Coordinates of C-alpha atoms in Angstrom, one line a residue:
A25 CA -17.3 -66.4 -20.3
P26 CA -16.3 -64.4 -23.6
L27 CA -15.2 -66.4 -26.6
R28 CA -11.6 -67.3 -27.2
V29 CA -10.5 -65.8 -30.8
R30 CA -8.5 -68.3 -32.6
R31 CA -6.5 -66.0 -35.0
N32 CA -4.4 -66.0 -37.8
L33 CA -0.6 -66.8 -37.2
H34 CA 0.5 -64.4 -40.0
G35 CA 2.1 -61.6 -38.2
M36 CA 2.2 -62.6 -35.0
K37 CA 5.5 -61.8 -32.7
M38 CA 7.1 -65.2 -31.8
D39 CA 6.3 -64.3 -28.2
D40 CA 3.1 -64.0 -28.8
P41 CA 0.8 -65.3 -26.1
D42 CA -1.2 -67.5 -28.0
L43 CA 1.7 -68.5 -30.1
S44 CA 3.8 -68.5 -27.0
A45 CA 1.1 -71.0 -25.1
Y46 CA 1.3 -73.3 -27.3
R47 CA 5.2 -73.7 -28.2
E48 CA 4.9 -74.1 -24.2
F49 CA 2.5 -76.7 -24.4
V50 CA 4.2 -78.5 -27.1
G51 CA 7.8 -78.4 -25.0
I52 CA 5.9 -79.7 -21.7
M53 CA 3.9 -82.8 -23.7
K54 CA 7.2 -83.7 -25.2
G55 CA 9.2 -83.9 -22.2
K56 CA 6.7 -85.8 -20.3
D57 CA 6.4 -90.1 -20.8
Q58 CA 5.8 -90.7 -24.5
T59 CA 4.1 -94.0 -23.1
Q60 CA 1.5 -92.3 -21.2
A61 CA -1.6 -91.0 -22.8
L62 CA -1.0 -87.5 -21.9
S63 CA 2.2 -87.2 -23.6
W64 CA 2.8 -86.0 -27.1
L65 CA 3.1 -88.9 -28.7
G66 CA 0.3 -90.6 -26.7
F67 CA -2.3 -87.3 -28.2
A68 CA -0.9 -88.0 -31.3
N69 CA -1.8 -92.1 -31.6
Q70 CA -5.5 -91.2 -31.1
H71 CA -5.1 -90.0 -34.8
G72 CA -2.6 -93.0 -35.5
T73 CA 0.9 -94.5 -35.6
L74 CA 3.7 -94.1 -37.6
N75 CA 3.9 -98.3 -37.9
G76 CA 0.1 -99.1 -37.3
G77 CA -2.0 -96.9 -39.2
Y78 CA -4.8 -95.0 -38.6
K79 CA -6.5 -95.3 -35.8
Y80 CA -9.7 -93.4 -34.4
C81 CA -8.6 -90.6 -37.8
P82 CA -11.6 -90.2 -40.1
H83 CA -9.9 -90.0 -43.6
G84 CA -12.3 -90.4 -47.1
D85 CA -15.6 -90.3 -45.4
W86 CA -18.1 -87.4 -44.0
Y87 CA -16.7 -87.5 -40.4
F88 CA -13.6 -85.9 -41.4
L89 CA -14.2 -82.3 -40.3
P90 CA -16.3 -83.0 -37.0
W91 CA -14.2 -85.5 -35.9
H92 CA -10.9 -83.0 -36.7
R93 CA -12.4 -79.8 -35.0
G94 CA -13.0 -82.4 -31.8
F95 CA -9.2 -83.6 -32.2
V96 CA -8.4 -79.6 -32.4
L97 CA -10.3 -78.7 -29.2
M98 CA -8.7 -82.2 -27.3
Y99 CA -5.5 -79.7 -27.9
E100 CA -6.8 -76.7 -27.3
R101 CA -8.0 -77.9 -23.8
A102 CA -5.0 -79.1 -23.3
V103 CA -2.6 -76.1 -23.6
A104 CA -4.9 -74.3 -21.4
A105 CA -4.3 -76.4 -18.8
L106 CA -1.0 -77.4 -19.1
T107 CA 0.1 -73.8 -19.6
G108 CA -2.2 -71.9 -17.0
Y109 CA -3.0 -69.7 -20.6
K110 CA -7.0 -70.1 -19.8
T111 CA -8.0 -67.7 -22.9
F112 CA -5.6 -69.6 -25.1
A113 CA -6.7 -69.9 -28.5
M114 CA -5.5 -72.5 -31.5
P115 CA -3.8 -70.3 -33.9
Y116 CA -4.2 -71.2 -37.7
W117 CA -2.3 -71.2 -41.0
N118 CA -4.0 -69.6 -43.8
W119 CA -2.0 -71.2 -46.6
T120 CA -4.2 -69.3 -49.5
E121 CA -2.8 -66.0 -48.2
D122 CA 0.9 -67.8 -46.5
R123 CA 2.3 -70.5 -49.4
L124 CA 5.3 -71.2 -46.9
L125 CA 5.3 -73.0 -43.9
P126 CA 5.0 -70.6 -40.9
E127 CA 8.0 -69.1 -39.3
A128 CA 7.6 -70.4 -35.8
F129 CA 7.6 -73.7 -37.2
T130 CA 10.4 -73.5 -39.1
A131 CA 12.9 -71.9 -36.5
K132 CA 15.1 -74.8 -34.8
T133 CA 15.3 -72.7 -31.6
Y134 CA 13.5 -70.4 -29.4
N135 CA 14.7 -68.0 -27.0
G136 CA 18.1 -69.7 -26.8
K137 CA 16.9 -73.3 -26.1
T138 CA 15.5 -76.2 -29.0
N139 CA 11.9 -75.1 -30.7
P140 CA 9.5 -77.2 -29.8
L141 CA 7.8 -76.4 -32.9
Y142 CA 10.7 -77.4 -35.0
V143 CA 10.5 -81.2 -36.9
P144 CA 13.9 -81.8 -38.7
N145 CA 14.1 -82.8 -42.0
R146 CA 10.6 -81.5 -43.6
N147 CA 10.2 -80.7 -46.9
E148 CA 10.6 -76.9 -47.7
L149 CA 7.1 -76.1 -49.7
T150 CA 9.0 -75.2 -52.8
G151 CA 9.3 -76.8 -56.4
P152 CA 7.4 -79.9 -56.4
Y153 CA 6.4 -79.3 -53.1
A154 CA 4.8 -75.8 -53.4
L155 CA 1.2 -75.3 -52.3
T156 CA 0.1 -73.7 -55.8
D157 CA -3.1 -71.9 -56.9
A158 CA -4.2 -75.2 -58.1
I159 CA -3.8 -76.3 -54.2
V160 CA -4.8 -72.9 -52.0
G161 CA -5.8 -70.8 -54.8
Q162 CA -8.4 -67.9 -53.9
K163 CA -10.1 -68.6 -57.1
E164 CA -8.8 -71.6 -58.4
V165 CA -10.0 -73.6 -55.1
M166 CA -11.6 -71.8 -52.2
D167 CA -14.5 -70.2 -53.9
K168 CA -15.4 -73.6 -55.5
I169 CA -15.2 -74.7 -51.9
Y170 CA -17.5 -72.1 -50.6
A171 CA -20.1 -72.3 -53.9
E172 CA -20.5 -75.9 -52.8
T173 CA -24.3 -76.3 -51.2
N174 CA -24.0 -79.7 -50.3
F175 CA -22.3 -81.4 -47.3
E176 CA -21.8 -84.4 -48.7
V177 CA -19.7 -82.9 -51.4
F178 CA -17.8 -80.3 -49.9
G179 CA -17.1 -82.4 -46.6
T180 CA -17.1 -86.1 -48.5
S181 CA -19.6 -88.3 -48.4
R182 CA -20.6 -91.1 -46.1
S183 CA -18.6 -94.2 -45.5
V184 CA -18.4 -97.3 -47.6
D185 CA -17.4 -100.4 -46.5
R186 CA -15.2 -102.5 -49.6
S187 CA -14.0 -105.3 -47.6
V188 CA -17.4 -107.3 -48.4
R189 CA -19.2 -107.9 -51.8
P190 CA -21.0 -106.2 -52.7
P191 CA -19.7 -102.3 -51.3
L192 CA -21.7 -101.6 -48.0
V193 CA -22.7 -98.1 -48.0
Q194 CA -23.0 -97.0 -44.3
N195 CA -26.1 -98.5 -42.8
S196 CA -25.6 -98.2 -38.7
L197 CA -23.9 -95.7 -36.2
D198 CA -21.1 -98.2 -35.4
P199 CA -18.3 -96.4 -35.0
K200 CA -16.7 -98.4 -37.2
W201 CA -17.7 -96.4 -40.0
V202 CA -15.7 -93.3 -39.0
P203 CA -12.4 -95.1 -40.1
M204 CA -13.8 -96.6 -42.8
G205 CA -12.9 -94.3 -45.4
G206 CA -14.6 -95.4 -48.9
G207 CA -16.4 -92.1 -49.5
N208 CA -15.6 -89.6 -52.3
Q209 CA -13.5 -86.7 -51.0
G210 CA -14.2 -83.4 -52.0
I211 CA -11.8 -80.2 -53.3
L212 CA -11.4 -79.6 -49.3
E213 CA -9.7 -83.2 -48.7
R214 CA -7.8 -83.8 -51.7
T215 CA -6.9 -81.1 -52.7
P216 CA -5.5 -77.9 -50.3
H217 CA -6.3 -80.6 -47.1
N218 CA -4.2 -84.0 -48.2
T219 CA -1.7 -81.4 -50.8
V220 CA -0.4 -80.3 -47.3
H221 CA 0.2 -83.4 -45.5
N222 CA 1.7 -84.6 -48.7
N223 CA 4.3 -82.0 -49.2
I224 CA 5.5 -81.1 -45.7
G225 CA 7.2 -84.1 -45.5
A226 CA 7.9 -86.1 -42.3
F227 CA 5.6 -86.6 -40.0
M228 CA 2.5 -84.9 -42.0
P229 CA 2.1 -88.0 -45.0
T230 CA 1.5 -90.5 -42.6
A231 CA -0.8 -91.8 -40.2
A232 CA 1.2 -90.3 -37.0
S233 CA 1.0 -86.5 -38.3
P234 CA 0.4 -84.8 -35.3
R235 CA 3.7 -85.5 -34.2
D236 CA 4.3 -82.5 -36.7
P237 CA 3.0 -79.4 -34.2
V238 CA 2.1 -77.4 -37.5
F239 CA -0.6 -80.6 -37.7
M240 CA -2.9 -78.2 -35.4
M241 CA -1.9 -75.0 -37.6
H242 CA -3.0 -76.8 -40.8
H243 CA -6.6 -78.4 -39.4
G244 CA -7.0 -75.1 -37.5
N245 CA -7.2 -73.4 -40.7
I246 CA -9.4 -76.8 -42.0
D247 CA -11.8 -76.2 -39.0
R248 CA -11.9 -72.4 -40.2
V249 CA -13.1 -73.3 -43.8
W250 CA -15.7 -75.5 -42.3
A251 CA -17.1 -72.6 -40.0
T252 CA -17.0 -70.1 -42.6
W253 CA -18.9 -72.4 -44.9
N254 CA -21.9 -72.2 -42.3
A255 CA -21.4 -68.5 -41.7
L256 CA -22.1 -68.0 -45.5
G257 CA -25.3 -70.2 -44.9
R258 CA -24.5 -73.2 -46.1
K259 CA -26.0 -76.5 -44.4
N260 CA -24.4 -79.6 -42.5
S261 CA -26.0 -83.0 -43.2
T262 CA -29.4 -83.8 -42.5
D263 CA -28.6 -87.2 -42.2
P264 CA -29.2 -89.1 -38.9
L265 CA -26.6 -91.3 -39.5
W266 CA -24.2 -88.4 -39.5
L267 CA -25.5 -86.3 -36.8
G268 CA -26.4 -89.5 -34.9
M269 CA -22.6 -90.1 -34.8
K270 CA -20.4 -90.7 -31.2
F271 CA -16.3 -91.4 -30.6
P272 CA -16.2 -93.1 -28.3
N273 CA -13.2 -92.4 -26.2
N274 CA -11.5 -91.4 -28.7
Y275 CA -10.4 -88.4 -27.2
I276 CA -8.0 -87.6 -24.2
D277 CA -9.0 -85.0 -21.6
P278 CA -5.7 -82.5 -20.1
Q279 CA -5.7 -85.5 -16.8
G280 CA -5.0 -88.3 -19.4
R281 CA -8.3 -89.7 -19.4
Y282 CA -10.6 -90.6 -22.2
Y283 CA -13.2 -88.7 -22.9
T284 CA -16.1 -89.1 -25.7
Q285 CA -17.6 -86.5 -28.2
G286 CA -20.2 -86.6 -31.2
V287 CA -21.1 -84.8 -34.0
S288 CA -23.6 -83.0 -32.8
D289 CA -21.6 -81.7 -29.9
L290 CA -19.5 -80.4 -32.4
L291 CA -21.6 -78.7 -34.6
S292 CA -21.3 -74.8 -33.5
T293 CA -17.7 -73.5 -32.3
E294 CA -19.4 -71.2 -30.1
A295 CA -20.9 -73.9 -27.8
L296 CA -17.3 -75.0 -27.6
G297 CA -16.1 -71.5 -26.6
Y298 CA -14.4 -70.4 -29.7
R299 CA -14.5 -68.1 -32.9
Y300 CA -12.1 -67.1 -35.4
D301 CA -11.0 -63.9 -36.3
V302 CA -12.5 -63.6 -39.3
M303 CA -15.9 -64.5 -40.4
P304 CA -18.0 -63.3 -42.8
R305 CA -21.9 -63.0 -43.1
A306 CA -24.3 -65.0 -44.8
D307 CA -24.3 -64.6 -48.8
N308 CA -27.9 -65.9 -49.2
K309 CA -27.1 -68.2 -51.8
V310 CA -29.9 -70.1 -53.3
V311 CA -29.9 -74.1 -52.8
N312 CA -30.9 -76.4 -55.9
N313 CA -33.8 -79.1 -54.2
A314 CA -33.6 -81.4 -57.2
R315 CA -29.4 -81.1 -57.3
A316 CA -29.1 -82.0 -53.3
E317 CA -31.6 -85.0 -54.2
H318 CA -29.9 -86.6 -57.0
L319 CA -26.6 -86.2 -55.2
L320 CA -28.0 -87.9 -51.7
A321 CA -29.0 -90.8 -54.6
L322 CA -25.6 -90.9 -55.9
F323 CA -23.7 -91.3 -52.5
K324 CA -26.1 -94.4 -51.8
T325 CA -25.2 -95.8 -54.9
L326 CA -24.7 -91.2 -65.6
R327 CA -22.0 -92.8 -68.5
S328 CA -19.4 -95.5 -67.0
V329 CA -16.5 -94.7 -68.9
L330 CA -13.4 -96.9 -68.0
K331 CA -12.8 -99.2 -70.7
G332 CA -10.1 -101.4 -71.6
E333 CA -8.5 -104.7 -69.4
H334 CA -5.6 -103.2 -66.9
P335 CA -6.0 -99.7 -67.4
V336 CA -3.2 -97.5 -66.3
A337 CA -2.4 -93.7 -65.9
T338 CA 1.7 -93.4 -65.4
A339 CA 3.5 -89.8 -65.6
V340 CA 4.1 -89.7 -69.2
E341 CA 0.9 -92.1 -70.4
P342 CA -2.6 -90.3 -69.7
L343 CA -5.4 -92.4 -68.6
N344 CA -8.0 -91.9 -71.2
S345 CA -11.1 -91.9 -70.9
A346 CA -13.7 -91.2 -74.2
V347 CA -17.1 -89.6 -72.8
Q348 CA -20.4 -89.8 -75.4
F349 CA -23.5 -88.2 -74.4
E350 CA -26.4 -87.2 -76.3
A351 CA -26.5 -84.3 -79.1
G352 CA -26.8 -81.6 -76.7
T353 CA -25.6 -81.4 -73.4
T354 CA -25.8 -78.0 -66.5
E355 CA -23.2 -79.5 -64.1
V356 CA -20.9 -82.3 -65.3
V357 CA -19.3 -84.3 -62.5
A358 CA -16.8 -87.4 -62.6
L359 CA -16.7 -90.3 -59.8
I360 CA -13.3 -92.0 -59.6
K361 CA -13.6 -94.6 -57.1
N362 CA -11.4 -97.0 -55.3
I363 CA -8.0 -95.5 -56.7
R364 CA -4.7 -97.5 -56.4
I365 CA -1.5 -95.5 -56.1
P366 CA 1.7 -96.7 -55.8
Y367 CA 3.8 -95.5 -53.2
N368 CA 6.1 -93.5 -55.8
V369 CA 3.2 -91.3 -56.9
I370 CA 2.2 -88.1 -54.6
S371 CA -1.0 -86.8 -56.9
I372 CA -2.9 -87.4 -59.6
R373 CA -3.3 -84.7 -62.4
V374 CA -7.1 -84.6 -63.9
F375 CA -7.0 -82.8 -68.0
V376 CA -10.1 -82.9 -70.4
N377 CA -9.0 -83.0 -74.0
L378 CA -5.4 -83.3 -73.6
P379 CA -4.7 -87.4 -74.6
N380 CA -0.9 -86.5 -74.7
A381 CA -1.0 -84.8 -71.2
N382 CA 2.3 -85.8 -69.1
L383 CA 3.8 -84.4 -65.6
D384 CA 5.7 -81.6 -67.5
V385 CA 1.8 -80.2 -68.5
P386 CA 1.7 -77.2 -66.2
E387 CA -1.6 -76.6 -64.5
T388 CA -2.1 -72.8 -66.0
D389 CA -3.0 -75.5 -69.2
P390 CA -6.5 -74.6 -70.4
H391 CA -6.9 -78.6 -70.3
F392 CA -6.0 -78.1 -66.5
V393 CA -8.9 -79.6 -64.0
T394 CA -7.6 -80.0 -61.0
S395 CA -5.2 -81.9 -58.6
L396 CA -5.7 -84.7 -56.7
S397 CA -3.9 -85.7 -53.4
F398 CA -4.7 -88.6 -50.9
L399 CA -2.7 -90.4 -48.2
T400 CA -1.2 -93.6 -48.2
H401 CA -6.6 -100.7 -46.0
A402 CA -9.4 -98.7 -47.7
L403 CA -8.9 -97.1 -51.3
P404 CA -9.8 -93.2 -52.3
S405 CA -12.4 -92.3 -54.3
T406 CA -13.4 -88.6 -55.3
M407 CA -15.6 -86.6 -57.6
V408 CA -14.4 -83.9 -59.6
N409 CA -16.4 -81.2 -61.3
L410 CA -15.4 -80.7 -65.1
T411 CA -18.2 -78.2 -65.4
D412 CA -15.6 -74.8 -65.2
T413 CA -13.3 -76.3 -67.7
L414 CA -15.5 -77.7 -70.3
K415 CA -16.7 -74.1 -70.2
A416 CA -13.6 -72.8 -70.5
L417 CA -12.9 -75.2 -73.7
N418 CA -16.3 -74.6 -75.4
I419 CA -16.8 -78.1 -75.7
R420 CA -18.1 -79.1 -79.2
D421 CA -20.6 -82.0 -79.6
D422 CA -21.1 -83.7 -76.9
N423 CA -18.0 -86.0 -76.4
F424 CA -14.6 -85.1 -74.5
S425 CA -12.0 -86.9 -73.0
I426 CA -10.7 -87.4 -69.3
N427 CA -7.1 -87.8 -68.9
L428 CA -5.8 -88.7 -65.5
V429 CA -1.6 -88.0 -65.3
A430 CA -0.3 -90.1 -62.7
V431 CA 2.7 -87.4 -60.9
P432 CA 5.6 -89.4 -59.7
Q433 CA 7.5 -88.3 -56.4
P434 CA 10.4 -86.0 -56.8
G435 CA 13.6 -87.5 -57.9
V436 CA 11.7 -91.3 -59.1
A437 CA 12.6 -92.3 -61.8
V438 CA 9.2 -92.6 -64.5
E439 CA 10.0 -95.7 -65.2
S440 CA 10.3 -96.9 -61.7
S441 CA 7.0 -95.0 -60.4
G442 CA 4.2 -97.0 -61.5
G443 CA 1.1 -97.1 -62.5
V444 CA -2.6 -95.5 -61.4
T445 CA -5.4 -97.4 -61.8
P446 CA -8.7 -96.4 -60.6
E447 CA -11.8 -99.3 -60.6
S448 CA -14.5 -97.6 -62.0
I449 CA -14.7 -93.5 -63.6
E450 CA -18.2 -92.7 -63.9
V451 CA -19.6 -89.5 -65.1
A452 CA -22.7 -87.6 -64.5
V453 CA -25.2 -84.7 -65.8
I454 CA -26.5 -83.3 -62.7
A455 CA -29.5 -82.2 -64.1

């Protein structure tokens, strides 16, 4: 059978057969008994629930991409089955090019009846919720993602269990490592992916995010980024712990029976019967073998920089950490581990050489590094590449500062937003 072509939502007529089949599917699924496995809620429950937290969904570890590919495929197969449109292909939302939520999902009605794709009380993606260039920009974000050659950096690193002393890095194929989290989140996860989830509001910031039908457009694009990454020539992890992991009874088939897939089942979109409408050819970017070896040792756990008793980052008082290296010092990364983020804080902004940074400093500032966003049980961690910002600033000597600004939820008084405290901040020079 010819491959199904997952297509960009932009430009689709509202009755486009692909879009129409999905809308029809969400309507069917919402009309079913929501206590059954074969229902809109039953499908979402495999991801997580509003009041129970995450179930099988991985956040903050290297199973992020493969599990969501199987999750999207689970929905895609159900659409074809329940609607009869056998050639259905899940559309995707390219937020890099289209910064607002797609038309088909903001419309309250379709064809006289209420629109199953609609969710009430979403945030309009403007103002503090805008998908700006620092979140989804082609040069600022996407090009950085595609330049990464190491999978654990690109698609988040291996799981770590911090409910034990000392922390236990993943050492088995037990499926408990999938929702474990504890890894270092890459650009893809903690900038465009998490910010879209947080900014949309309603269901998307929660563990029940698939209850918003736009979840599939968002993760269709994430899956496209992974496919695009591979198509450029980038290699997935060759670690047996990643390749061998199974997702036992994580998914539900169109008849309401649980089924199993694994990472190795979900490596090729062509093997699952689909492709994307736009896909580049290989770019022949050489991979540095020394860089990969150093990174691999980092992820099976370099100056540690977090000083002070109870160090904290607020909206007006940034967490400042001074780094000092030997004279003459090429890539520089920062590891921010186990970040306690209160409910009142929506994101963290990273600066260098701006010890007086605050929430009002614009991201066009030359000291701006990146925006970090996480889904608020394991704590989040991330790695931040400072190289580009250091080069842009023409760093003098071998010392600088890292400044973390806690960005409060819109409308929350800064005095009430609390403080962001990471457990450690380590800076390493990757050869």
